[PDB]
Amino acid sequence: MSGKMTGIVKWFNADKGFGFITPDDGS
Amino acid sequence: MKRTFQPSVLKRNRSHGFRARMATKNGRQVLARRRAKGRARLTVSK
Amino acid sequence: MIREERLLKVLRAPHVSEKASTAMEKSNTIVLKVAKDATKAEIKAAVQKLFEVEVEVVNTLVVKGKVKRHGQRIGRRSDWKKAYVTLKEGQNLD
Amino acid sequence: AVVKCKPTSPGRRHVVKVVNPELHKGKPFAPLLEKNSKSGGRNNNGRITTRHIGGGHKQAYRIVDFKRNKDGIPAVVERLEYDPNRSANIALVLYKDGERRYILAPKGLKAGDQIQSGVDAAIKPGNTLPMRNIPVGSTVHNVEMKPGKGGQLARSAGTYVQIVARDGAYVTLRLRSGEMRKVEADCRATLGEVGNAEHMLRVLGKAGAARWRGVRPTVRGTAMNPVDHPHGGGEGRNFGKHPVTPWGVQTKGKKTRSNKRTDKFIVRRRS
RNA sequence: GCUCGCCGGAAGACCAAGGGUUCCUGUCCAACGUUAAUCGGGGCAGGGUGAGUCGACCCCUAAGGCGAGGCCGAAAGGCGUAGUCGAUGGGAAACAGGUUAAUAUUCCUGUACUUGGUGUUACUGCGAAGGGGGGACGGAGAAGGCUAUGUUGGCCGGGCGACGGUUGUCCCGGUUUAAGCGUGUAGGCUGGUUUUCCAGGCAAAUCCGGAAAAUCAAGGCUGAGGCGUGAUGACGAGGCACUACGGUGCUGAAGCAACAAAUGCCCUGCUUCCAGGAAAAGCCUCUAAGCAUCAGGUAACAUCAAAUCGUACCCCAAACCGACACAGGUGGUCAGGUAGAGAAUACCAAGGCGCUUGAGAGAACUCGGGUGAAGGAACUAGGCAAAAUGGUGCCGUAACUUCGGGAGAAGGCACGCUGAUAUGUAGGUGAGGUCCCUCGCGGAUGGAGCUGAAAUCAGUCGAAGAUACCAGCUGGCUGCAACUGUUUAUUAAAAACACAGCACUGUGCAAACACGAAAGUGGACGUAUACGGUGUGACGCCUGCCCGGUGCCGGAAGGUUAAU
RNA sequence: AGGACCGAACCGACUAAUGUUGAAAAAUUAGCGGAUGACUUGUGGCUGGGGGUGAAAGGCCAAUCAAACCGGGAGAUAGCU
Ligand SMILES: [Mg+2]
Ligand SMILES: [Mg+2]
Ligand SMILES: [Mg+2]
Ligand SMILES: [Mg+2]
Ligand SMILES: [Mg+2]
Ligand SMILES: [Mg+2]
Ligand SMILES: [Mg+2]
Ligand SMILES: [Mg+2]
Ligand SMILES: [Mg+2]
Ligand SMILES: [Mg+2]
Ligand SMILES: [Mg+2]
Ligand SMILES: [Mg+2]
Ligand SMILES: [Mg+2]
Ligand SMILES: [Mg+2]
Ligand SMILES: [Mg+2]
Ligand SMILES: [Mg+2]
Ligand SMILES: [Mg+2]
Ligand SMILES: [Mg+2]
Ligand SMILES: [Mg+2]
Ligand SMILES: [Mg+2]
Ligand SMILES: [Mg+2]
Ligand SMILES: [Mg+2]
Ligand SMILES: [Mg+2]
Ligand SMILES: [Mg+2]
Ligand SMILES: [Mg+2]
Ligand SMILES: [Mg+2]
Ligand SMILES: [Mg+2]
Ligand SMILES: [Mg+2]
Ligand SMILES: [Mg+2]
Ligand SMILES: [Mg+2]
Ligand SMILES: [Mg+2]
Ligand SMILES: [Mg+2]
Ligand SMILES: [Mg+2]
Ligand SMILES: [Mg+2]
Ligand SMILES: [Mg+2]
Ligand SMILES: [Mg+2]
Ligand SMILES: [Mg+2]
Ligand SMILES: [Mg+2]
Ligand SMILES: [Mg+2]
Ligand SMILES: [Mg+2]
Ligand SMILES: [Mg+2]
Ligand SMILES: [Mg+2]
Ligand SMILES: [Mg+2]
Ligand SMILES: [Mg+2]
Ligand SMILES: [Mg+2]
Ligand SMILES: [Mg+2]
Ligand SMILES: [Mg+2]
Ligand SMILES: [Mg+2]
Ligand SMILES: [Mg+2]
Ligand SMILES: [Mg+2]
Ligand SMILES: [Mg+2]
Ligand SMILES: [Mg+2]
Ligand SMILES: [Mg+2]
Ligand SMILES: [Mg+2]
Ligand SMILES: [Mg+2]
Ligand SMILES: [Mg+2]
Ligand SMILES: [Mg+2]
Ligand SMILES: [Mg+2]
Ligand SMILES: [Mg+2]
Ligand SMILES: [Mg+2]
Ligand SMILES: [Mg+2]
Ligand SMILES: [Mg+2]
Ligand SMILES: [Mg+2]
Ligand SMILES: [Mg+2]
Ligand SMILES: [Mg+2]
Ligand SMILES: [Mg+2]
Ligand SMILES: [Mg+2]
């Protein structure tokens, strides 16, 4: 019921939460 | 945390209001664009 | 002296209520729905002329309109004005 | 009198106060005050024009007679006062007709002395008379450049100017910087050195004492990035370049005077 | 409804901002609510916000904005004068009690107050866009006087105890009262008064300021609180009656004193320091043109007016900002008891909650904790984390030092309760009483009563007396940075930045420089003991050689050399 | 007296654990630093993108910064997938 905002821009990933789980060993 | 929207009607209307748009040339072009698009709320001002 | 045509366009209706019946029986005060732009002097002159009754004092307040939903479409009722008109003692009104 | 502070705390370790007990311990003269709103070094565009300025204690402006036009009328010195707007102390004087004014306090001036401007003024420290009436070789301050414009030279706490010559319409001055300058011989000047000579003997001791005076901290240019300053950058401490402004102008030695209007008034430059 | 538990400087109460009807009542349970739901900030309908004194509006201005003309600019437009906006600041006035399902300093009762009007009467220099005064202002600190408020006693009302005892040195509760008006106090500031004169305050001035002379030391301003009145009132424990058990009506006792006491008030004070601490109007006053016996002025009285808008509700939160009924964030006000230095902390009051899934079981494992034999860092990159220390008073305390520190160094002793000193001391408070008086909110004397540490001595209990919560681990060598500070919001708080200081150099004022096609503005209403830039970075001892290169400064004889 | 000391409010964020489709798009718990000053905070105002501001980390400029966001040139170009 007026239930939008589910997968619109997936801000889910616009969060872009910091990656690179301290693995700069692959250098 | 302290988020980026801390409302205040005086600052909202002085910054984005009708008289502030009608004051300058470019602000009058903003109201002409919203009238051409057919906006219901032409500005912030209630 | 406020003209009679405006005095005839000031008053809209009496307001029926438990509070209105209480103020009528205790303080001898009627509760009126008035025009929104009507002032206290226009109300006191209207009640003193159209009802032929002696007005002691008039207190006013503005009633904000409620937001209703007809079906699911939103809407908002009108703001209207309410007057507590205190009659002098001995005076009587329907 | 300079007073070295006892080191009860760092920040009092190196403080030297300049204590003058003759200054008035009260409010200044209210009619001669006006509002002095701070700027932050920002012009009418809001941009910072001159950096490192900001903050500090609130300061009221004291209206100071530099033009010094009350000729003939003697004036007694009422009291000495502190001026936050400037390094020199000011003197509240009372003319005979009932007018009170502020002047710059000279060296030996105290409460109760008599001063007098005008041509028929005497020659004592405090008097103001034209330099065609002032003898060659005397020390004056509050010196006009143009007649009636007001004194502009030698206004800081301990300064003075010697009169070394006169050739008709002009007198030649020895400025405190060492520059020899011609001034018209009708410009007013005030006898004696300016008062608070030990002002430069103070030591602020701590950073807050400059923040009290509205001096924001100065970031040196090599501690920056190259987008910010020409000196910026380096992977350590590197300065392999000539010292410039933030705008790329040589600082160590390069002259910047470009006034061809006043070169006829300059006898010798400083040095 | 009875128990239990939690907060209680909040998880209570009042607001601003913000939201915008979420408020109250009736009704419904589809959806919403992380379950059910008869419930709800949900749906539906109705009701509800009452002001001359609260606030806004309004008068006034700050930063700043706009800006007639104006200056400038290809155009747009930029800056800015006169002006005009702009609060977060200045400016008149109302309190107590009662009442609604929901509003109240708004309604009602009582008692006040303010500013404007018109009209009367008496009196008669009124008058500003101008002059002056005032408004009008900082930090820190020290006490003194108070009050809020609390405690105890007295007083009044009630009680005599589910289990030993309890008519008493016993238990519970209450003991409230305003604005205003009068008095002008502790205390703070101040020399008053009269006349003459005067290059000043754009002109004037009786005003301010300044010169004189004479007289009087004692007048004035401000001022918390108290006292009286307000108030024979109101409120009031309780009773007396009806009772839809919710309530409604009637009646109503005592309503005092002492002590302690604020971070609140006197205090916009006083003292002191340097970093030297808004403006304008309202208000008071002065005269200018003008008005000349008119206008206007103040004094009393009467009368009238005081409009309009907001007012419900949340407001450290389920209603605001976070997508959520989200463990986050959000500014002001109030500040009870016992212990305690305390607004910490523990337990409580008033008041409000138990956080919108529960019920069992009592595996591994994880989370948050408790205890642990012997050993005591052997763990580990590393004593990470834990554990430990922890208070007051006294004794005592090293190297080194910039003589301040180090230092709470380290280390150690005492600490409960009862009694005596002293049926509660020293001290504080201060009555009666008496005397004096220029008489009052007076001054002595006087010590009642109240309050009340701390210490010594004796005794006594426990394993343990800073018994809980709370509450430093310490020391030795050394690198770096002088220090306090600042910084990568969201992996880096550091030796990095800054710093006081030092030096070089520029800059003579229409300053250099910077923002701006420009006008202009900052620097600075400053003037070389100043300002800008650059490097170094307290302090102590110091800072040596090189000008060839690259820069910069100075030179101007010669060579070269542009447009023309 | 003090950019003095201990320490609540307040401001900050040194360490560990949890959590990491979280209660939370950076927080909680236990400790921690400053706490009369170069302090902190409320309201309002000003500075605008090659620009601001910056006790200087290329930090911050609306959860976005070695050059913000929105719209347009624009169906940029892409010997690349
Ligand atoms: Mg009324
Ligand atoms: Mg109203
Ligand atoms: Mg500077
Ligand atoms: Mg420096
Ligand atoms: Mg520096
Ligand atoms: Mg760097
Ligand atoms: Mg460069
Ligand atoms: Mg290197
Ligand atoms: Mg090298
Ligand atoms: Mg219950
Ligand atoms: Mg509890
Ligand atoms: Mg609704
Ligand atoms: Mg409700
Ligand atoms: Mg309901
Ligand atoms: Mg069902
Ligand atoms: Mg459900
Ligand atoms: Mg509802
Ligand atoms: Mg202005
Ligand atoms: Mg303008
Ligand atoms: Mg114009
Ligand atoms: Mg105005
Ligand atoms: Mg305001
Ligand atoms: Mg006002
Ligand atoms: Mg209510
Ligand atoms: Mg004035
Ligand atoms: Mg102050
Ligand atoms: Mg009392
Ligand atoms: Mg018993
Ligand atoms: Mg018994
Ligand atoms: Mg009792
Ligand atoms: Mg009274
Ligand atoms: Mg309310
Ligand atoms: Mg609450
Ligand atoms: Mg919940
Ligand atoms: Mg919450
Ligand atoms: Mg307490
Ligand atoms: Mg607490
Ligand atoms: Mg278990
Ligand atoms: Mg343990
Ligand atoms: Mg063990
Ligand atoms: Mg053991
Ligand atoms: Mg080992
Ligand atoms: Mg090992
Ligand atoms: Mg540890
Ligand atoms: Mg521990
Ligand atoms: Mg004892
Ligand atoms: Mg080493
Ligand atoms: Mg350091
Ligand atoms: Mg530090
Ligand atoms: Mg930070
Ligand atoms: Mg970080
Ligand atoms: Mg960190
Ligand atoms: Mg200038
Ligand atoms: Mg360095
Ligand atoms: Mg050298
Ligand atoms: Mg060379
Ligand atoms: Mg050369
Ligand atoms: Mg040549
Ligand atoms: Mg400190
Ligand atoms: Mg501390
Ligand atoms: Mg914490
Ligand atoms: Mg870098
Ligand atoms: Mg960001
Ligand atoms: Mg850019
Ligand atoms: Mg680019
Ligand atoms: Mg194209
Ligand atoms: Mg494409």
Numbering used by the authors:
A (entry chain B): 1 to 27
B (entry chain c): 1 to 46
C (entry chain S): 1 to 94
D (entry chain C): 2 to 272
Q: What does the report in the manuscript say about this coordinate set?
A:
As a model protein, we have chosen the cold shock protein A (CspA) from Escherichia coli, which is a major regulator of the transcriptional response during cold adaptation in many bacteria. It consists of 70 amino acids (aa) that form five β‐strands connected by loops. Strands 1–3 form an antiparallel β‐sheet that is closed into a barrel by packing strands 4 and 5 to strands 1 and 3, respectively. Here, we combine biophysical methods with cryo‐EM structure determination to show that folding of a β‐barrel protein begins with formation of a dynamic α‐helix inside the ribosome.
To explore the nature of CspA intermediates inside the exit tunnel, we determined the structure of the ribosome with the 27 aa‐long CspA nascent chain (CspA27) by cryo‐EM. After in‐silico particle sorting, we solved three structures that showed different conformations of the nascent chain and carried the P‐site tRNASer corresponding to the mRNA codon 27. The cryo‐EM densities for the CspA‐27 complexes reveal three different nascent chain conformations inside the tunnel. In conformation 1 (CspA27‐1), the nascent chain is more extended at the N‐terminal part; the region immediately below the constriction site appears more compact. In all three conformations, the CspA nascent chain makes numerous contacts with exit tunnel residues. In all conformations, U2609 and A2062 are in contact distance with the nascent chain. Arg61 of L4 has identical orientation in CspA27‐1 and ‐2, but contacts the nascent chain only in CspA27‐1. Finally, when we extend the PTC comparison to CspA27, most of the PTC nucleotides superimpose between all structures, except A2602, which adopts a rather distinct orientation depending on the nascent chain conformation. However, when examined at lower threshold (contoured at ~1.5σ), nucleotide A2602 cryo‐EM density can be observed distinctly displaced toward the A site in the extended CspA27‐1. This position could potentially alter placement of the incoming aa‐tRNA and suggests a mechanism whereby the nascent polypeptide folding could locally attenuate the elongation rate by modulating aa‐tRNA accommodation.
